[PDB]
Structure formats: structure tokens, C-alpha cells
Design a protein around this ligand. Structure first.
Ligand SMILES: NS(=O)(=O)c1cc(NC(=O)Cc2ccccc2)ccc1Oc1cccc(Cl)c1
Ligand SMILES: NS(=O)(=O)c1cc(NC(=O)Cc2ccccc2)ccc1Oc1cccc(Cl)c1
Ligand SMILES: NS(=O)(=O)c1cc(NC(=O)Cc2ccccc2)ccc1Oc1cccc(Cl)c1
Ligand SMILES: CC(=O)N[C@@H]1[C@@H](O)[C@H](O)[C@@H](CO)O[C@H]1O
Ligand SMILES: CC(=O)N[C@@H]1[C@@H](O)[C@H](O)[C@@H](CO)O[C@H]1O
Ligand SMILES: CC(=O)N[C@@H]1[C@@H](O)[C@H](O)[C@@H](CO)O[C@H]1O
Ligand SMILES: CC(=O)N[C@@H]1[C@@H](O)[C@H](O)[C@@H](CO)O[C@H]1O
Ligand SMILES: CC(=O)N[C@@H]1[C@@H](O)[C@H](O)[C@@H](CO)O[C@H]1O
Ligand SMILES: CC(=O)N[C@@H]1[C@@H](O)[C@H](O)[C@@H](CO)O[C@H]1O
Ligand SMILES: CC(=O)N[C@@H]1[C@@H](O)[C@H](O)[C@@H](CO)O[C@H]1O
Ligand SMILES: CC(=O)N[C@@H]1[C@@H](O)[C@H](O)[C@@H](CO)O[C@H]1O
Ligand SMILES: CC(=O)N[C@@H]1[C@@H](O)[C@H](O)[C@@H](CO)O[C@H]1O
Ligand SMILES: *[C@@H]1O[C@H](CO)[C@@H](O)[C@H](O)[C@H]1NC(C)=O
Ligand SMILES: *[C@@H]1O[C@H](CO)[C@@H](O)[C@H](O)[C@H]1NC(C)=O
Ligand SMILES: *[C@@H]1O[C@H](CO)[C@@H](O)[C@H](O)[C@H]1NC(C)=O
Lengths: 316, 316, 316
């Protein structure tokens, strides 16, 4: 049955010799955002404000919601209310003990956080970060309308193949005022953050309150036997974190950083920013194949050997 | 024809069992640069100045040219000249409209940027970044002479193989005053930035004006049947971005960041730096093989099966 | 010998069709530490202090020891003692010559660093970084007791498989007060830095003095023929760097960064921090297999073909 083995080699790509992809990614974010709060007045956020890591290859972080604590100085200080931190006598707090909250290290004497309750005195940057819910709606909801240009460049080493996701039919005039869309502009690398989140069956406005990790995946599945015109990337978007709050720890995505200031007196103070944002991971993978005689001959020989079993079984 | 199948197994590595490489890279940049300009006077740039991401594993950024806008404050403000931003009456500017330039959000009234023309007021950090060409020659042309030490460590999991690119015939005395060169010192990991760019058929002085992305690739192709003395990495360098300006968007490589200052009055100002630099991507790939009986037997059986087809064809 | 080929296919996974893993990692470090020195007095280090890269996906840097040079102003200056920088006359120093130390560029005249010796004047930030060993024991030795939560998410594209390292049998109540331990809590992702370093046959206290690169590796070896309950990651830890000082360059792991301040007079000063820390690399790899008819048939045919050689050899 030469037809059977021929069809098997045709559809299983057994005659193919395959190789992996070596990729480079560069993303640039463009947009502006306006915030209007009592504390910050009226404010605008340029490209240098809402991208906390200014440029890291492979991913980017877009700040969406955020909490500030200003004028923090190292001092002995009160503690946030907590059942493990309540004071009934000066002997309750253990000198030098380190707690799981991580606000600071305890001391012997303890002071009153307020008139009603007293908590252990700790060494820390005070005033401490107030334990409050993040603002809703998010400050940077305008980050729904940002754009991101993703430039990709792959190489297949063994076959000596180089390619970029910007197809050569496209020109700069079209790319200046272009926006990606599956129905209209499938070849445009300039995505919209709102579209990226929406195509993963999510809502950006709800996501931005606590953040989340979103992955953008690009598939480079190119058949090098056919000309390079059919070597085209395919874009997919997925949500990487977990919605369910009963299984994971610290739902959402956020992190803390600081800005250090030196006063006129020489004392060092710091402003602590806790930022929640959407982190976009760019993942590139693929596998490309070419023609080779030796695998074809090996597969043909093995198929003809299996034809012996086919005949033996047909005999019975 | 046992000779044919034997030679096929010998050269095609059908008897081989292959595995991929798990790698780690660490790079240190050493050098100094001096600049002499009217705005900054005479200046020297240490290791902490021209490497904007201080240490990220896998790649590093070397600043070469820059545009600085100092003492930027939040304010209602003028707009850079642009055909879409020209004022003929106060009703031209749309309240709250967001433009594609991204300098700021528009307001109702508009003032004169200069005596000749008037542009819409915007909420923004001002004075705005002036639209000017980057300085030529670049400020950090001395970055042609920097050195970079690349320490690489690979592991093949299945075969339990660990290796480092620093060969054990080398000692610290040689590596203290060493530099890489194909003809003289091929085993030295200490490359020169000018040499790295030159080996890719590029000119550092021209390309540093607007930047570019270079990839430094290391190939770990080791045959574990032979002793480990033949497991040696191979270095290659190539240019990742595109020179041609009529196909891509925003030619070159650059990014913007900010330094935030607090005045005596408490108002917050920022210095906006737009830096054009050379980003070096370190990409490590390879595949190592070892002897295995089962693939050898399978290939031998398939070859002997194909000998049947060979005999059948020879009969005709 | 159908039994032989059957056993070969059973144990060699010949019938399997394999695919690689596409992974994402997220690490959160929790802990607090106190330092007591003459220069810094009594100090506490929060999450925003000892993690110099605030959040980079795939690795994190935990500061352990440091050298601070404060109030550095750009000016003409003296030089650190060095046999290549000693002065016997004003003609010894070469104007504009760039040295291998990298402290600064030389000038014509040279000045007495101290009463005993004189060195070349250089343009640099001063006072220069004093050449002294890092403090022992390290300032941030308390970083032995920190915790790190590692959340992993893998996908196999061809088989359409998605998984996380947080098993469904685990709940948030257990994960709130959990810690990893091989004997007691093997499914907990919350590791301890001291445990991570210790299980690599290292001591944290001696390693933190000069730092080092530690690799945390996760293996996702899942057989998809069996249910997903057997798809479980496996954790291993290695010491990536080299202890031997006679083969490598700059033993340990450290890097330099700066904090820029603006004085009242408008002059710009900077504080230069040289930080030694432990860099933890998270490397995720794996390979998953499923059942496919065509490889099974090909392997069976080749085995039956090799049975011919088996019979021929047995005949002799
Ligand atoms: N784009 S940036 O230069 O990297 C940058 C942006 C911001 N964002 C804000 O300040 C937002 C804000 C504005 C006004 C008041 C309060 C908050 C803060 C610090 C920044 O610097 C770095 C650099 C490296 C790592 C890190 Cl964590 C920070
Ligand atoms: N090597 S560094 O510490 O990371 C660093 C270097 C510079 N470079 C300059 O200031 C050059 C300069 C000097 C004087 C006037 C004008 C320009 C600026 C800020 C830096 O800090 C960070 C840290 C993380 C992310 C980012 Cl975007 C920045
Ligand atoms: N967690 S952080 O925001 O990223 C951060 C932490 C620290 N660490 C200290 O200041 C320790 C210290 C405290 C007091 C006196 C002397 C030293 C310094 C600067 C920081 O900012 C960046 C941001 C991006 C890149 C870089 Cl290199 C730095
Ligand atoms: C409390 C406050 O400042 N409110 C104003 C609001 O009246 C105004 O319409 C808006 C325009 O941007 O800016 C904000
Ligand atoms: C406007 C305001 O809150 N100012 C306070 C200041 O009175 C206090 O002395 C300082 C603590 O160092 O914190 C800040
Ligand atoms: C898909 C599409 O419209 N592509 C356009 C093409 O129509 C146009 O002729 C060209 C201008 O040179 O720019 C590009
Ligand atoms: C504008 C200015 O300061 N120019 C001087 C230049 O005349 C001198 O030759 C050089 C020597 O380093 O230093 C700089
Ligand atoms: C020398 C110079 O340009 N100084 C100006 C200052 O007059 C102005 O007040 C400030 C903006 O607040 O920007 C800066
Ligand atoms: C290629 C080369 O010259 N390698 C040198 C070797 O000649 C010298 O004996 C040794 C000193 O121990 O340092 C290394
Ligand atoms: C020189 C100095 O600062 N010594 C103090 C010591 O008196 C005190 O008992 C200890 C507790 O934190 O901290 C340190
Ligand atoms: C306490 C101390 O050392 N202060 C000095 C100051 O006197 C000097 O003017 C400055 C150099 O600009 O360096 C600092
Ligand atoms: C291994 C282990 O103890 N797992 C615990 C389980 O015993 C407990 O019943 C459950 C509470 O819902 O949390 C989890
Ligand atoms: C995004 O832009 C559209 C139209 O330009 C506007 O209707 C929408 O409100 C914007 N999104 C946000 C969050 O403001
Ligand atoms: C690099 O150094 C060489 C000699 O040390 C010198 O001739 C050359 O001009 C230097 N490069 C630059 C850009 O100054
Ligand atoms: C870590 O904690 C244990 C107990 O909580 C303590 O015995 C040990 O001294 C701590 N390590 C350091 C370096 O302080």
C-alpha cells in the first residue's frame, strides 16, 4: 500500500526537518492620560510616567491605579491596628521581635495609635502606608486607549532564515496612522491596549482596579519549502493570572517602589508608591521545516516494513 | 548495501540523542567617557551614568546620544507648531480633545506660541521637549572604546552537563589585561563595543547618532561522545533593526525617562531625558547529543527495510 | 521477538509525540531587616529598599551588602594610590590619557593625594569611591530569613495545555501562613531565601559578603496520556557562579548605581552605591508528550525490520 505511506508522509510532515526560532522583541507605548483628584489636583501622565520600567525587552508595565504615601521618615512610631499588635500592657510587645506584617521591628514600650486602642511601637518609615482599598474607578482608566507598537525579528539558525513581522508590502505612510484590527487591518503591528484586553474576553475597566498579567503570544509557523510569502506570524492574547480569590495569593498585579528626597536639613525622606497595573508579556515561539532526503528515505523504509505486518494481518 | 546505511548513520547523526541548552548570562561594562558641550560644560560619565538599566541579565543598554529638557512643571501651556494645531479662532481648539502627538490635552482658549502663529493651550509639563535633531557627532562617541565582559553558564539537563565559557586553560592573570580578537585572542570573553559593531559590517560613529539594536549570539554545539575539550562556544554578532527608512516606523533605538525633583516651595519638577543608545541582545542557543542504542537500532532497521526498495528498483 | 520491540516502545517513549513548554513566572519577596552602624545609625529596610530592580519577571536581586560614597561633585580631583599613577614630576601625567582604572581622565598638572605621595589630577565625581573591602558580617544578613512566593504558569501549545504550579487541592487559608519544606510542605511555592541557598550546599552568611548568582530551576515533565493529577513541577537549585578565584574575573556579584540630587545652589550631586547581592535566576523548562498513531506504526515497522537482522545474526 504505497498510497497509504505516501499520504502518511504527506500529512504527518515526516519528510520535514524542523528547527526552532530565535527571536527579538521591541515594544513602544504611545498615549496620554489625565487624572483629576483632590490630592493631586489636575494632572497629566506622559510616556515617562505610566511605564515604570522605562524599557525592558520582552514585556512592559502600564500603571493604572496607585496609592501614594508622602514624606516618610525613619522613626519610632505607632502600628496599624491588628489583633496581634494590640496593647494591654507594656510587657505585651516583645523587644526586637519581627512580625509577619513587615511594617517594622517591635520595641519594648508601646504607644496609642488612637484614643480607643494602643499598638506596639516600631521602627519604620512613618507615616505608615494606610491600609485602604485602591480607588475605583482607576485613576488611569484613559490607559484603555493607549497604543503599543511591537516589532519582532526572528531567525532560524540551521536554515539561515531571517524575518521581521513588518511585511514588505506595508509602507511607513500606512504605518503612521494605522491601528490593528482583525477584520480590517490584520497586518498592522500597532495594537490598542483596550483591544488586547478585550480579545482575551476581559474588561479593561475592571482589570485596571487591581491589575493583572496578560500574555501576548506570536506564533511563527513557517514552511520553508514554500516561498517566504507564506511565512506570516499569528497573534493570540491570553490572561495569565487567576480570577478566583479562593485558590491564589494576593490576586491581581501590583508592586511597590520609592522616590528618595533629601531635605534642606539633610534628613532623607521617601515617597512610597504602590502601583497596580496590567503587565503585558510578549511570548514568541515557532518551528520551521525544510526538505531533507534522509528522513524521507528512513520513513519510507519503515512504512514498507510495516506493510509486512499489514500483509500478515490481512492473511489471517 | 550496509556501507550506505552506515555512512548515512555516521554523517546524519541518526545514532545521536539530542537535548537543548539552559543558559545564564552576566555582562559587565567597563569604560569612561568625556563630553564637552556648552550646556553641560565639561563632563565625565562613569559606569553608573551611561548604562540606564543598571543590571538586567541577558542584555544591556549603552547610552550614546541624548536630549535633555530641564525644569518641567505642570501647567497650562502653549503647543509646538503643527498644521493640526494652528489657531485661527478660539473655537478651533476642541475642549478636552486628545491629539495623536501626545504632548497634552487641549483646552478652550488658545494663545500664541510665537508672534507669527498661535497654537492651542495644553495641560502638560512645560517647557515642552523641543523638536530638534540629535547632536552630531554623538556626545558619547568615546563609547566606541568601552569593554564588556560576558560570563556564560550552560546546562544540558538530560545528560547532566554543566559548562562555562571561561575555559580552564585560562587564568585570571591573562584575563586581567585581555581583549577579544579573532586572530590573536579567540578565547577571551572581554569584547570591545567598537569591535562588536564592526564585526557586523557597521560603523559605530554613524549608528550611535540614532542608536540601533545589535544581537550577540553564542552557539553551544557540543558532541558529548567526544571529551569535553571539544565543547567550545562560537560567537557571532549581527544587526537586528532595519536601516531602511521607507518600511519601518521610528528608525533607530531610543527611549524617554525622567528624574523627579522637589523644589524648596514643595512644587514637583522633572527633567525629561530622551536617550538614543545601542542595545546589545545576548542570545544563547545550542543542541548537544549523546550516543544511544535504541535510535541506532531503529535507523539500522529502517535502512535495511529501504534496501528492499533499492533491490526492487535495481531489478527493473 | 515482538516482546522485545514492545518493551522498547514502552520504555523508550517511542510512541510518544513531544512538545516544549511556554512559561511565565512572577516572584514576590516579603521580609524586613534592621541595620545598626555608625554612619547610618539605626536603619530599617523595607520591600522597596533591598530589591534594586523593583520588579523584573524571571529573576530578582536581593541586596545584602553595600558601599556608599555620598555627596559626589564633578570637579578636578586627586587620584587613588596606584603604581601607574604616582607622580615624580609634572611631565609624568599625560594630558587627556585614559587609564584602565576608569576613575577619570588625566590632566597636565598633578597634586598630592597625601603628604607622602602625589598622583595625577583627574576630572571626576569626588570624593572618589574609597578602595576598601565590604563590611563583614554583611549589613543585610537578616535577608537570610526573607520569603519569596513564586507563581508559575505554563502552556503547551500543540496539545492546548494550561497549568499553574499552585495545585487545586491547595487553598488560600493554607497559603497565608505556609512555608516550603521538602519533608512537610512539598506543594508550597513560598520558599525561604536561607533554605534556597542552603539546599544548594552553600552558606548564606559567607556568600552574602560578596554575593553570587543562584539559579532556581523548575521542571515541568508531564505525561498527558495519564490524567493531569500527575503533571507536577519539580524544584531544583544550583549555584551558578564560580567560587575559585584563580580562573574567573571579579568573583562574586555586584553592581553600581547612583541617586541624583540637586542642591539649593543648583549644582548637581550624586550618591554612588556599590551593592553586592544574591541574584536568583528562575529557569523553567520541560517537555510533555501525548499519544500518536503514526510514530507508533513507524517504530513498529522499523523494529520488525531489525528483527530480520536479528534472525540473520542468530542463523550464524
Ligand atoms: N518612567 S520612570 O522614569 O522609570 C519612573 C516613573 C515613575 N512614575 C511616577 O512618578 C508617577 C507619579 C507622579 C507624580 C506623583 C506620584 C507618582 C516613578 C519613578 C520612575 O523612575 C523609575 C525608574 C526605574 C524603576 C522605578 Cl520603580 C522607577
Ligand atoms: N545608571 S542609573 O542609576 O540606572 C541612571 C542613569 C541616568 N543617566 C543620567 O542621568 C545621565 C545624565 C546626567 C546628567 C545630566 C543629564 C543626563 C539617569 C537615571 C538613572 O537611574 C535610573 C534607574 C532606573 C531606570 C532609569 Cl530610566 C534610570
Ligand atoms: N526599590 S527601588 O525603587 O528600585 C531603589 C532602591 C534603592 N536602594 C537604596 O536606596 C538603599 C539605600 C537606602 C538609604 C541609603 C543608601 C542606600 C535605591 C534606588 C532605587 O530606585 C531604583 C530604581 C531602578 C533602578 C535602580 Cl539602580 C534604583
Ligand atoms: C474639583 C475640580 O477641580 N473640578 C474641576 C471641574 O470643575 C472641571 O470641570 C474639570 C475640567 O477639567 O476639572 C476639574
Ligand atoms: C503638610 C504636612 O503634612 N507636613 C508635615 C510636617 O509638618 C511634618 O513635620 C513632617 C514630618 O517630618 O511631615 C510632613
Ligand atoms: C492594505 C492597504 O491599503 N495598503 C496600502 C495600499 O493600499 C497603498 O496603495 C499603499 C500606498 O503606497 O500603502 C499601503
Ligand atoms: C568650551 C571649553 O571649555 N573648551 C575647552 C577647550 O578649549 C580645551 O582645549 C579643552 C581641554 O580639555 O577643554 C574644553
Ligand atoms: C534659568 C531659567 O530658565 N530659569 C527658569 C525659571 O525662571 C522658571 O521660573 C522655571 C519654571 O518654574 O524654569 C526655569
Ligand atoms: C595563550 C596564552 O598565551 N596563554 C597564557 C600562557 O601562555 C601563560 O603561560 C599563562 C600564565 O600562567 O597565562 C595564559
Ligand atoms: C552604638 C549603638 O547604636 N548602640 C545601640 C545599642 O545601644 C542598642 O542596645 C541596640 C538595640 O537596637 O542598638 C544599637
Ligand atoms: C559634612 C561634609 O563632609 N560636608 C561636605 C561639604 O563641606 C563640602 O562643601 C561638600 C563638597 O561640595 O562635600 C560635603
Ligand atoms: C496538606 C494539608 O494539610 N492541607 C490542608 C488540609 O489539611 C485542610 O483540610 C485544608 C482546609 O480547607 O487546607 C489544606
Ligand atoms: C477612548 O476613546 C474613545 C473615542 O476616542 C472614547 O469614546 C472613550 O471614552 C475613550 N476611553 C476612555 C477610557 O476615556
Ligand atoms: C579609542 O582609542 C584609540 C586608541 O586608544 C583612539 O585612537 C581612538 O580615537 C579612541 N576612540 C575615540 C572615539 O576616541
Ligand atoms: C532568622 O530567624 C530565626 C528564628 O526566627 C533566628 O533564630 C535567626 O537568628 C534569624 N536569622 C538572622 C540572620 O537573624
Amino acid at each position: 500500500i504505497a498510497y497509504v505511506i505516501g499520504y502518511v508522509c504527506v500529512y504527518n510532515k515526516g519528510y520535514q526537518d524542523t528547527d526552532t526560532v530565535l527571536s527579538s522583541v521591541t515594544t513602544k507605548v504611545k498615549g496620554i492620560a489625565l487624572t483629576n483628584t483632590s490630592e493631586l489636583g489636575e494632572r497629566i501622565w506622559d510616556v515617562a510616567d505610566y511605564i515604570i520600567p522605562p524599557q525592558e525587552d520582552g514585556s512592559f508595565f502600564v500603571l493604572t491605579n496607585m496609592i501614594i504615601t508622602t514624606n516618610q521618615t525613619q522613626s519610632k512610631c505607632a502600628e496599624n491596628p491588628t489583633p496581634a499588635s494590640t496593647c494591654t500592657s507594656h510587657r505585651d510587645c516583645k523587644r526586637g521581635f519581627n512580625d509577619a506584617r513587615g511594617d517594622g521591628v517591635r520595641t519594648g514600650r508601646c504607644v496609642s495609635y488612637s484614643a480607643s486602642v494602643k499598638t506596639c511601637e516600631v521602627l519604620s518609615w512613618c507615616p505608615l502606608e494606610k491600609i485602604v482599598d485602591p480607588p475605583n474607578p482607576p485613576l488611569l482608566a484613559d490607559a484603555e486607549n493607549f497604543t503599543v507598537l511591537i516589532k519582532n525579528n526572528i531567525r532560524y539558525p540551521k536554515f539561515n532564515f531571517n524575518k521581521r513581522n513588518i511585511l514588505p508590502n506595508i509602507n511607513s505612510s500606512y504605518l503612521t496612522h494605522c491601528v490593528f484590527s482583525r477584520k480590517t487591518d490584520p497586518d498592522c503591528p500597532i495594537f490598542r491596549l483596550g483591544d488586547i484586553v478585550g480579545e482575551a474576553e476581559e474588561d479593561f475597566q475592571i482589570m485596571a482596579v487591581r491589575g493583572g498579567v496578560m500574555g501576548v503570544q506570536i506564533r511563527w509557523d513557517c514552511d520553508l519549502d514554500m516561498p517566504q510569502s507564506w511565512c506570516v506570524p499569528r497573534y493570540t492574547f491570553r490572561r495569565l493570572d487567576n480570577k478566583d480569590p479562593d485558590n491564589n495569593v494576593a490576586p491581581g498585579y501590583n508592586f511597590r517602589f520609592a522616590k528618595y528626597y533629601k531635605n534642606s536639613d539633610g534628613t532623607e525622606t521617601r515617597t512610597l508608591i504602590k502601583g497596580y497595573g496590567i503587565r503585558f508579556d510578549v511570548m514568541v515561539f515557532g518551528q520551521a521545516g525544510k526538505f531533507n532526503i534522509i528522513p524521507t528515505l528512513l520513513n519510507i523504509g519503515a512504512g514498507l516494513a510495516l506493510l509486512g505486518l499489514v500483509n500478515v494481518i490481512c492473511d489471517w
